[PDB]
Amino acid sequence: AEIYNKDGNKVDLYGKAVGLHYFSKGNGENSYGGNGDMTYARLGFKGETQINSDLTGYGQWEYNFQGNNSEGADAQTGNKTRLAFAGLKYADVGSFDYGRNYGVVYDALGYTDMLPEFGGDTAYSDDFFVGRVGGVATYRNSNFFGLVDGLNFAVQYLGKNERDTARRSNGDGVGGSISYEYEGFGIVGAYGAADRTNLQEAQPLGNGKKAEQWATGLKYDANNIYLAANYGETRNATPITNKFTNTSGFANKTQDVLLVAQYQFDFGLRPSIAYTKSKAKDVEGIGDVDLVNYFEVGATYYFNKNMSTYVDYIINQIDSDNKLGVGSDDTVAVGIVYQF
Amino acid sequence: AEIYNKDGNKVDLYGKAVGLHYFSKGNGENSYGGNGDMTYARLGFKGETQINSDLTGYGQWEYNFQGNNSEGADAQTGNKTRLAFAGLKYADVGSFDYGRNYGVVYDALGYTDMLPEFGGDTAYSDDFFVGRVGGVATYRNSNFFGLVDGLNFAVQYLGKNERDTARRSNGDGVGGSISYEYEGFGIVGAYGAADRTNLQEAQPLGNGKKAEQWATGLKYDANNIYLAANYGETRNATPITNKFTNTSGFANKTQDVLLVAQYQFDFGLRPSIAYTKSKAKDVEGIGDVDLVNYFEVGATYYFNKNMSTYVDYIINQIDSDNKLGVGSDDTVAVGIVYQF
Amino acid sequence: AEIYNKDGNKVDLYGKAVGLHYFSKGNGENSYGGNGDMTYARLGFKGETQINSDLTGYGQWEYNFQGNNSEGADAQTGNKTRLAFAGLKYADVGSFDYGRNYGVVYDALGYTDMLPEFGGDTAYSDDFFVGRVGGVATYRNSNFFGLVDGLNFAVQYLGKNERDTARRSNGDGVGGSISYEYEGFGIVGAYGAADRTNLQEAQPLGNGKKAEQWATGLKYDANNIYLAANYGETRNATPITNKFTNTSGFANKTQDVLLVAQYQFDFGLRPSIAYTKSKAKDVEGIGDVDLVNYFEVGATYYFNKNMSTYVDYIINQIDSDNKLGVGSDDTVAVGIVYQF
């Protein structure tokens, strides 16, 4: 909600209260998303200032508060700053912003990440170029310097993040994306390469000094119709876990496919169907394994721009004898969303 | 303070900064409230959207930030999300919201929870139905479908919360309440029952598979006069600790009595007196023992709807040879509250 | 940014997004400020209500969110409530506020705490009277009861904080400050003394029952010119660490000197240079040793009151053979800041 607009500076204070519960069979240890309350809140601000007729400065912040914790010792469990950056936009030159913002490959992955609750399974947080990540400087250009309508591109530099855990770690990297839109159609390709930290190589699973992520996408977004497809490959880049041996790390190679089909009825209903297959190869001791594999059917009901409820049903295709101990049970989400 | 109201949606951004100090003799280890700085801040949003003439949507979030912590490792000690839910309200049919909201029995306990700082001692956080608690879907209905002015009631369903601590866990449960008000008078009855977790039974104190909490209240609230009385009973639900044996759990049976008397003077002062006695029975190894027992004297001075100060003196009736090692000393609070 | 003004209460919601990166050779520990991503965000409210034509009430809250953390287990590392207090201001009597607020000695140190990124090394967090501290009660008076323009003073009481770390602990104490300004010029003096906790004496470094901090400053702040000079001494108060022995504590005596020179060009540039030397004496086992010693050159370019960028280069004079293992390398900061 824009709550300040004066002297060439505007501040939108946005957020939401999302009441949410997951239902899966048994306890749901062996399920896709789990079982129980998943209620949460978002808060964030978008600030934008007009420095002059061509030049804009801006900054955005966003925090996820969890609401399924007690007021006890676990009060902070799952709270996080999701976004935190600042940047400039100048004429038809382009924009540059630095901080913790989504990685360049998500430019593609965003295409299919449209589901009521789930989906976009391959957009892991702090996972190099496929998701939200600290320490990125990104340059973007719209309509190619004002000469080509619909031609966007971006080059991203990834700063080194040597953390205590291997999962949230990354080396220095470079990435990019190119996208074209014309009359409802959209095509995007994105690729990133990065150094791996020593701490990541010292891990049981995954082998290489270089992580590589690339993805392409197609979409049709018009007349209440949304269709989307993502295909991607990763080299030493998808985080994975062996549930039997209790070891952690990355998959040597993965192939990811996402399909999304949604229709927006005028009366409030937006039924959604989807398909996801993320498969790994060369997982040490295990080899080839499916990390993600499901059909999804769901629907969001929009009361208006501020209120919605949805049901998101994940039909698991993963087999109970999954070599990586991946959950095989189905999971259902029921959400009611106030936002501003 | 309502800081956005446009296109049929309003957002009230409220919070407070409460400078607060506790005074007990010595270390205040052996007292009711403790000794030292207790400064805190609250921040939150109450959002409401008008969907159509009968149907309103809403969502609320609320956070407690502690200010008596350093900027070191304990910076987070006592910060927590208090409220986080979303819901719908339809005509004279009623309202429904899901998430973290006050438990149903609070509808009774709210009558006596009116003190400047302390009081309402039997409304423990994460204690099934008497205080703020995770995972509740609540139906409330005012004036009985619009057919009976003043007759409100509510039914609450409590989701299972298997946490790391027994204190902060709860099983599956259901509760309900009925209140009637007429020309200053108010009467309320409330009752809830719920399953207990394994981790809760594996505690030294308390025996049963079922938690039960009920409370009733009478009150007169008119012409600057506030009177309130609560009586309630609990079975295997009230959290307790043995300070000697260092053992934890719930009391098998408790009886709670709270009286509150306040008058609001027009020149700003609101002197308050209260009495609280919460005693337990069938406490393993001890039997009958008083958990809470004090008379309270205090006064709050309102500068305005945004500024106040108070002094709250707790005269403890608990004896120093309390079988559960409960504090016997008095505690005084000095508060200055800015709010919006 | 003022976002509410109705019925005699105003609420300014302020905060920022600071994209920031640190540059030092190698990993970062043997440097001044470190190496890698340091993006952070602030959020806060300043509230003020008019009770009547003479009496004003106010409250402020301010929080730091870190953005250089992952979304894993380290999500909260470096987040903190910086400010949390409430107070009153009455006519020409003066103002009084309680909570977690800046120490009184900061009234002096503020003259020099003006660099684009670093500087103000003697404004330690939770360090009695030289930095932000919980449980302080301050009375302040401007223009000496309104009779003498430019003559301001403050008296501050520091409440006891028996915490887990000697670094973040403090006993009961008293402090004060007096400042006078005339036609661009300013002079300020401040002094505070306090009891030390048992846990603080039980530390290896530092000897005494009374901690003492005092500091004076001169400044000229007019016609785009900013100059500042600060000199101070501490007794058993500056937190210090032996990097070789992994021992922590306080320096028995410190002498601190700070110089700051800045000029604000009308076209947007504000170059800043500084000098800071904080050296300790009678440090157990070592004796005399330098804690802080550098020359600084940097510049902030202001796009407007909402957007700015800076480069701040620290030239460390600290020796690689520092007896306390204090980093000896230089550090460069690069920042881009949106604020409101």
Side-chain angles (χ1 to χ4, degrees), chain A residues 214-231:
Chain A
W214 69 263
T216 66
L218 281 178
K219 76 171 180 182
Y220 177 76
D221 183 13
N223 302 123
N224 302 319
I225 298 161
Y226 195 85
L227 308 182
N230 267 128
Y231 174 77

Side-chain angles (χ1 to χ4, degrees), chain A residues 80-156:
Chain A
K80 57 204 73 184
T81 39
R82 287 157 57 90
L83 286 159
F85 63 98
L88 306 176
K89 186 167 193 180
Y90 184 78
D92 279 316
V93 174
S95 73
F96 173 84
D97 59 81
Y98 179 78
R100 173 174 171 76
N101 201 341
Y102 286 64
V104 65
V105 178
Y106 188 63
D107 293 345
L109 304 179
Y111 273 19
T112 43
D113 183 11
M114 294 289 297
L115 299 196
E117 172 59 28
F118 304 101
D121 291 57
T122 77
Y124 302 109
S125 302
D126 302 282
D127 185 24
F128 302 104
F129 302 108
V130 301
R132 294 186 298 281
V133 41
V136 296
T138 164
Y139 160 82
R140 299 185 173 275
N141 186 274
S142 286
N143 306 308
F144 193 75
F145 300 58
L147 314 180
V148 184
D149 306 328
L151 173 57
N152 307 4
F153 78 87
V155 47
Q156 180 168 56

